Design a binder for these strands. Structure first.
Ligand SMILES: [Mg+2]
Ligand SMILES: [Mg+2]
Ligand SMILES: [Mg+2]
Ligand SMILES: [Mg+2]
Ligand SMILES: [Mg+2]
Ligand SMILES: [Mg+2]
Ligand SMILES: [Mg+2]
Ligand SMILES: [Mg+2]
Ligand SMILES: [Mg+2]
Ligand SMILES: [Mg+2]
Ligand SMILES: [Mg+2]
Ligand SMILES: [Mg+2]
Ligand SMILES: [Mg+2]
Ligand SMILES: [Mg+2]
Ligand SMILES: [Mg+2]
Ligand SMILES: [Mg+2]
Ligand SMILES: [Mg+2]
Ligand SMILES: [Mg+2]
Ligand SMILES: [Mg+2]
Ligand SMILES: [Mg+2]
Ligand SMILES: [Mg+2]
Ligand SMILES: [Mg+2]
Ligand SMILES: [Mg+2]
Ligand SMILES: [Mg+2]
Ligand SMILES: [Mg+2]
Ligand SMILES: [Mg+2]
Ligand SMILES: [Mg+2]
Ligand SMILES: [Mg+2]
Ligand SMILES: [Mg+2]
Ligand SMILES: [Mg+2]
Ligand SMILES: [Mg+2]
Ligand SMILES: [Mg+2]
Ligand SMILES: [Mg+2]
Ligand SMILES: [Mg+2]
Ligand SMILES: [Mg+2]
Ligand SMILES: [Mg+2]
Ligand SMILES: [Mg+2]
Ligand SMILES: [Mg+2]
Ligand SMILES: [Mg+2]
Ligand SMILES: [Mg+2]
Ligand SMILES: [Mg+2]
Ligand SMILES: [Mg+2]
Ligand SMILES: [Mg+2]
Ligand SMILES: [Mg+2]
Ligand SMILES: [Mg+2]
Ligand SMILES: [Mg+2]
Ligand SMILES: [Mg+2]
Ligand SMILES: [Zn+2]
Ligand SMILES: [Zn+2]
Lengths: 189, 69, 141, 53, 110, 181
RNA sequence: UCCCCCGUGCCCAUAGCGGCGUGGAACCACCCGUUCCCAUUCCGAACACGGAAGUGAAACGCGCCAGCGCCGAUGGUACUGGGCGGGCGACCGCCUGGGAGAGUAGGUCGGUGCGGGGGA
RNA sequence: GGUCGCCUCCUAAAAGGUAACGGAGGCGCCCAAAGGUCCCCUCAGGCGGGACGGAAAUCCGCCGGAGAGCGCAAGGGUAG
RNA sequence: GUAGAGCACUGAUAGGGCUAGGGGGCCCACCAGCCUACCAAACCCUGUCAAACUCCGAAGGGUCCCAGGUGGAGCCUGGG
């Protein structure tokens, strides 16, 4: 719902060492502050799997100051597909833009027609104050046939929240399966 | 104007079919039309004239229903 | 097969392959993807080979996504000809692949079932591979 | 040059000595050339014409 | 995006600017006509003689001829002889022409 | 600049009904004519015979002005065009010459066509203008019959400071346009 | 000496697009006419002269905000000059100065220099 | 068998230069206007309108910084 | 103007939305219904590839000024 995580400080000491030290490098910032931080890879993992860019992160500091945060961008090392640096957006009252999950619910007709659900977005951009940052947004996908698609505009949108991206953007859809029946004349031409 | 290529438009009258002396400034000293604005099956009302029908369909041809009804 | 239906030039240079991948480093459509661990030239005949494999594994079902597309022309001199007198001829096409790239990812099927149809998929592939799970990290870019 | 494009020496008039030479087309404009050309010989400007090269 | 008006400016403007010699810009509205001598290096004005400051009136062209002659006196007394003529996006003719012929006869040099 | 009765009709009748209609504030923003470009795009004297201007003399007798030609933009095999051939004519009518032309078409020429039935109303521009065309040429008896030859017509735009097609109609209708609908 | 307009540069979109308002006192624009000088491959549209009834609707001047455009760090990574290393090979990694592009946080409806005019 | 001189781009590793029977294309002309200058105009294109007349003949409207054009190939350049 | 990186331009490109055209329906076959688990331009989204694509861009390299630099350095005229 809203997670706390230990944190500390980076003066300038080598990122490469901190990394092999097992402590992840990081940064936190807003519009008034910028601070080099470092967290803890193990602990960070614990939280971030539950949290992602969706829920709230409370950064606990050595000085004992707590901080309301959203992860802004995570850097991944390519060869490994593993953490190497996070941005921590500390929130003021101002309705920061951010991504909240979507909950697809109600099995579509196409999925009972042996189709599949191509949920393109698992999140959604919104302007919304910290005082009411939502979670599961309702999506009623029960009634979409194969090939049919529901867009962006047609959505619950819990009042006090702004559809901060395109109206006719496409959130999810339903496509045909994969017949080996396809494979036949797939070959022909 | 760049003179030496333009037809000198004197004062002139367009004397029409029924009434209407469409007095103008014409390129000819006197031109003559036979149809005018005022009189037209469009300008002034729907206008009857000849246009009333052609093959009246059908009961409006009258004397229909000779038996008992 | 998979020719790029049209192209700006025909014969392409060879090129090195230094280092780690550029992009394609996160799942994006499926819920499980197949990951390259070593550089390669994957071929139109391999991509096709691996694809067909899974399709025939969960017959009628799933949605296969394919993230690398063979655009580079594999060139080769005929047999019993010596060095020079033109540059080789084109036979087949390939897709450059560095380590970290995703190549296949499937969406919507039993966790067991994807974990096979991507396992079998790897054996049709000329390299080392690891199957991966869609991720908070993955949705984080 | 070729054959439709002829080469030519610009002739003269006010002293009849030639002093220039250039190019022209005889399938385009099939006449005799025309340019003003000061001469080092007469020390005056003169209208010139042509003859083959 | 541009109007033919401002293109003509730049055009006529650009050339003259390349020859280094001083610049007698000629501005002209339906009411009055103005002018000012400019060194374009430092980017400064040497002397400005206008129809409005001179408070002249009585036919637009003949108005200007004086304002031109006015500019020459107010500059000769300063040391300028060499100055090339900017005719704005206006055809050199009549009104602008007058300003020139005035500056010309006043002893100014172009 | 000339005593024409349509110039005076626009003022002493058409101007006000418009201010009472769309309730204007300022006086200039009231809809008003601009030009009548008449395009006699013949396309039939290209590398075809002389005689092209044999209409651009009757075209002068209509419009009071001398028409100036239009050339071939680009070459087309299907039309027989080389980039430079003349195909059509165009006169731009500004000031009082513009008026006096309409003071003859709108109430003498438009009815001189057989099977006439008003004007097409969908054909308004979108930013306040309107146009159509015509085929018959002696539709104004300034062009008398024994000037007989092959009949050709004209494309005609009329240009106004109207800001939408809506109000625009109100102008052209108020200055005598029979509309088919 | 602050303010406002007009001219004209310098800067190179943080200046622009679009939007809301707006100013005719003076300047400026539209504007009045087409006799004259000048002009239209047709037209006083432009360019041109002669003026001054109207109007700031257009254009323009000035204000307003971030829909677009645009500028956009810090942290980190890529790559890398120099120097080394373990692999049978493919390729990887280490010290050392250098260090992006994308992207995030954000910035912006300008800043100005001489001349002229006009009220503090 | 192919090639042989000149031009454009790439190879060429951010000055120049750089090989191969390396990947690609052009030249052996043309113009008394396509040259000089002084003057004026601004595109390709897209949407609406447009008697013939169309995907595009000529026309009108907003739209647009250069994606058109600049004799021919390509590159750089180019509406200030 | 390279490595990187990027997609603003020339092109490639896989899924999705939109959507001219095209095809299968089929209503019907005079024009017209506009319906399509089929194809598919231009466009929008996610996601990518390029020696002859670059909105961007390193380290580096070139070179001129200043300073260090007395070296089997350097510079000019000549003989082998
Ligand atoms: Mg570092
Ligand atoms: Mg949880
Ligand atoms: Mg790495
Ligand atoms: Mg449907
Ligand atoms: Mg009478
Ligand atoms: Mg192998
Ligand atoms: Mg000689
Ligand atoms: Mg300056
Ligand atoms: Mg009069
Ligand atoms: Mg045209
Ligand atoms: Mg400067
Ligand atoms: Mg606004
Ligand atoms: Mg306002
Ligand atoms: Mg208001
Ligand atoms: Mg106002
Ligand atoms: Mg006012
Ligand atoms: Mg002219
Ligand atoms: Mg002109
Ligand atoms: Mg301000
Ligand atoms: Mg707003
Ligand atoms: Mg913005
Ligand atoms: Mg940095
Ligand atoms: Mg490194
Ligand atoms: Mg060095
Ligand atoms: Mg080294
Ligand atoms: Mg190793
Ligand atoms: Mg902001
Ligand atoms: Mg503004
Ligand atoms: Mg005042
Ligand atoms: Mg050199
Ligand atoms: Mg010439
Ligand atoms: Mg023009
Ligand atoms: Mg065009
Ligand atoms: Mg037409
Ligand atoms: Mg057409
Ligand atoms: Mg070029
Ligand atoms: Mg396809
Ligand atoms: Mg059909
Ligand atoms: Mg339907
Ligand atoms: Mg449908
Ligand atoms: Mg597209
Ligand atoms: Mg690549
Ligand atoms: Mg490159
Ligand atoms: Mg660039
Ligand atoms: Mg450098
Ligand atoms: Mg040098
Ligand atoms: Mg020696
Ligand atoms: Zn009558
Ligand atoms: Zn001589």
């Amino acid at each position: 719902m809203e997670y706390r995580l230990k944190a500390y400080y980076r003066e300038g000491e080598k990122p490469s060492a901190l990394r092999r030290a097992g402590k992840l490098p990081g940064v936190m910032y807003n519009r008034h502050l910028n601070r080099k931080v470092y967290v803890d890879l193990v602990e960070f993992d614990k939280v971030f799997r539950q949290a992602s860019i969706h829920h709230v992160i409370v950064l606990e500091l050595p000085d004992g100051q707590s901080l309301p945060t959203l992860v802004r961008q995570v850097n991944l090392d390519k060869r490994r597909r593993r953490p190497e640096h996070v941005d921590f957006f500390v929130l003021s009252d101002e309705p920061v833009e951010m991504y909240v999950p979507l909950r697809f619910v109600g099995t579509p007709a196409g999925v009972r027609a042996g189709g599949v659900l191509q949920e393109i977005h698992r999140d959604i951009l919104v302007k919304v104050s910290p005082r009411n940052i939502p979670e599961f947004i309702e999506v009623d996908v029960s009634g979409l046939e194969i090939g049919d698609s529901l867009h962006a505009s047609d959505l619950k949108l819990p009042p006090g929240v702004e559809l901060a991206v395109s109206p006719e953007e496409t959130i999810a859809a339903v496509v045909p399966p994969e017949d080996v029946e396809k494979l036949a004349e797939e070959a022909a031409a | 104007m760049k003179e030496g290529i333009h037809p000198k438009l004197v004062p002139a009258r367009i004397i029409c079919g029924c009434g209407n002396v469409i007095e103008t400034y014409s390129t000819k000293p006197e031109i003559y039309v036979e149809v005018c604005s005022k009189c037209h099956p469009f300008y002034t009302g729907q206008q009857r004239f000849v246009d009333t029908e052609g093959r009246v369909e059908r009961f409006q041809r009258r004397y229909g229903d000779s038996y008992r009804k | 097969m998979l020719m790029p239906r049209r192209m700006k030039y025909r014969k392409q240079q060879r090129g090195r392959l230094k280092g780690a991948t550029k992009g394609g480093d996160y799942v994006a459509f499926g819920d499980f993807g197949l990951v390259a661990l070593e550089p390669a030239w994957i071929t139109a005949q391999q991509i096709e080979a691996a694809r067909v494999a899974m399709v025939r594994h969960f017959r009628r079902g799933g949605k296969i996504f394919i993230r690398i597309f063979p655009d580079k022309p594999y060139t080769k001199k005929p047999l019993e000809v010596r060095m020079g007198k033109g540059k080789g001829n084109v036979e087949g096409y390939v897709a450059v692949v560095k380590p970290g790239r995703v190549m296949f990812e499937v969406a919507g099927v039993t966790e067991e079932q994807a974990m096979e149809a991507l396992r079998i998929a790897g054996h049709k592939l000329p390299i080392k591979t690891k199957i991966v799970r869609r991720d908070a990290y993955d949705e984080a870019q | 040059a070729s054959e439709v494009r002829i080469k030519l020496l610009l002739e003269c008039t006010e002293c009849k000595r030639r002093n220039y030479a250039t190019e022209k087309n005889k399938r385009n404009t099939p006449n005799k050339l025309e340019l003003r050309k000061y001469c080092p010989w007469c020390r005056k400007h003169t209208v010139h014409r042509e003859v083959k090269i | 995006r541009l109007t033919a008006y401002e293109r003509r400016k730049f055009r006529v403007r650009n050339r003259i600017k390349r020859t280094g010699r001083l610049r007698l810009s000629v501005f002209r509205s339906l009411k009055h006509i103005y002018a000012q001598i400019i060194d374009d290096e430092k980017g400064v004005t040497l002397v400005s003689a206008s129809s409005l400051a001179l408070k002249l009136k009585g036919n637009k062209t003949e108005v200007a001829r004086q304002v031109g002659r006015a500019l020459a006196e107010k500059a000769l007394a300063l040391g300028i002889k060499q100055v090339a003529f900017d005719r704005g996006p206006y055809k050199y003719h009549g009104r602008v022409k007058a300003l020139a012929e005035g500056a010309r006869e006043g002893g100014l040099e172009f | 600049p000339l005593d024409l009765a349509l110039k005076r009709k626009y003022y002493e009748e058409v101007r006000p009904e418009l201010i009472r209609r769309f309730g204007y504030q300022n006086v200039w923003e009231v809809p008003r004519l601009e030009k009548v470009v008449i395009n006699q795009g013949l396309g039939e004297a290209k590398e075809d015979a002389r005689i092209l201007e044999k209409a651009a003399q009757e075209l002068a007798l209509i419009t009071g002005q001398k028409p100036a030609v239009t050339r071939a933009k680009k070459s087309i095999s299907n039309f027989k065009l080389r980039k430079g051939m003349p195909i059509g004519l165009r006169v731009t009518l500004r000031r009082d010459r513009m008026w006096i032309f309409l003071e003859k078409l709108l109430n003498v020429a438009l009815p001189r066509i057989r099977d006439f039935r008003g004007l097409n109303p969908n054909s308004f521009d979108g930013r306040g203008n309107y146009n159509l065309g015509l085929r018959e040429q002696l539709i104004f008896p300034e062009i008398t019959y024994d000037m007989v030859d092959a009949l050709r017509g004209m494309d005609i735009a009329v240009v106004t400071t109207a800001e939408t097609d809506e109000e625009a109609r109100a102008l052209l209708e108020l200055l005598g346009f029979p509309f088919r609908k």
